[PDB]
Design a protein around this ligand. Sequence first.
Ligand SMILES: O=C([C@@H]1CNC[C@]12CCCc1ccccc12)N1CC[C@@H](c2ccccc2)C[C@H]1c1ccccc1
Length: 373
Amino acid sequence: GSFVEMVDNLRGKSGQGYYVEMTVGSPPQTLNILVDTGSSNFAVGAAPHPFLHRYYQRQLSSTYRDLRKGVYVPYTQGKWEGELGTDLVSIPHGPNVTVRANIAAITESDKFFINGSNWEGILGLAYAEIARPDDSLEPFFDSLVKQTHVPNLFSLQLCGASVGGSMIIGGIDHSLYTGSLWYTPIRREWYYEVIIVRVEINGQDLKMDCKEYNYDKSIVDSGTTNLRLPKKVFEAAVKSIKAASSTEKFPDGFWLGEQLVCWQAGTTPWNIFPVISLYLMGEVTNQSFRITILPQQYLRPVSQDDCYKFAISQSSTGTVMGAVIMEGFYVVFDRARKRIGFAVSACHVHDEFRTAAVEGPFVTLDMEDCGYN
Ligand SMILES: O=C([C@@H]1CNC[C@]12CCCc1ccccc12)N1CC[C@@H](c2ccccc2)C[C@H]1c1ccccc1
């Protein structure tokens, strides 16, 4: 394929995020940068920090322009602060272009950088609406599309377990997937917001009002590890997953992520755990499709023992389809056509009895009733 040089341009550690090399300034300064479809700022470590091997040195970059305004990104659960500027940015294993992008130079942070993650910054790939300090700060990808002829599309193949993957910028690599691509509309351009219309555990409908699946939003977020579900959905899903996997018993805290369970090397009974199906709104009236994930996806590896964390968790800010979901699939962020495509990944981690799937079409009525207003 023509996109060959962008294949396998992602690295990472399990549960710690996928990152791509980005080259900033003049002369060149290359950093490892977290690929995050759940935020909208391009920001880099710019001062020494215990968890950073390298950082951005603005004084050494002749093309760096100070924007003379501070920037702060808040969280649950930590934060970072820095200075706004612009500089020249290229992706050596991405598109053959160089753009002047907004860059936040991180000078202080709390619980942002992860010990041993090997990334030194973050690439916010979502829309300007959620950018800090506000929506006037053009996100990187917006700059890329405005300044170059790179098509308004990227795609992600995240390969789970030391992890790897591909970010194809400007197109779709057909070697990265099998079968067909199925598209769900981007409801609104802020986060990558989608609509979930039905949930099944081992083919059994969870039978909740579909509004609950998308309260108060459902997003596709490459920077979040887990499948995160609204409290009511989480509880019903856990109750159903428990009942489906009853050939073995697990402590209550396992389902809450407070306890881990370990198996002797290569003896994890994947077969005892159910498959989970998320149905997404399709592109045609009353039409949906489903993506199916294996226990290999939602049980994350954390001696001769393999330890696993239950990687479905509770959320009070909507559903978050994180890496747990994305790792089964080749995921197309077709910004040009306001839609997200899903196909079975060529690097899909499966066993000999079951496989991750993207299947359709299905008939689902009143799907418009499922969205939060
Ligand atoms: O939710 C996120 C991202 C979205 N995907 C992964 C995320 C979610 C899970 C946590 C996390 C951790 C590291 C990197 C990414 C992410 N944010 C970016 C960084 C985050 C932050 C975290 C810790 C300290 C300071 C800032 C603030 C937030 C944010 C997003 C959008 C607007 C404002 C803030």
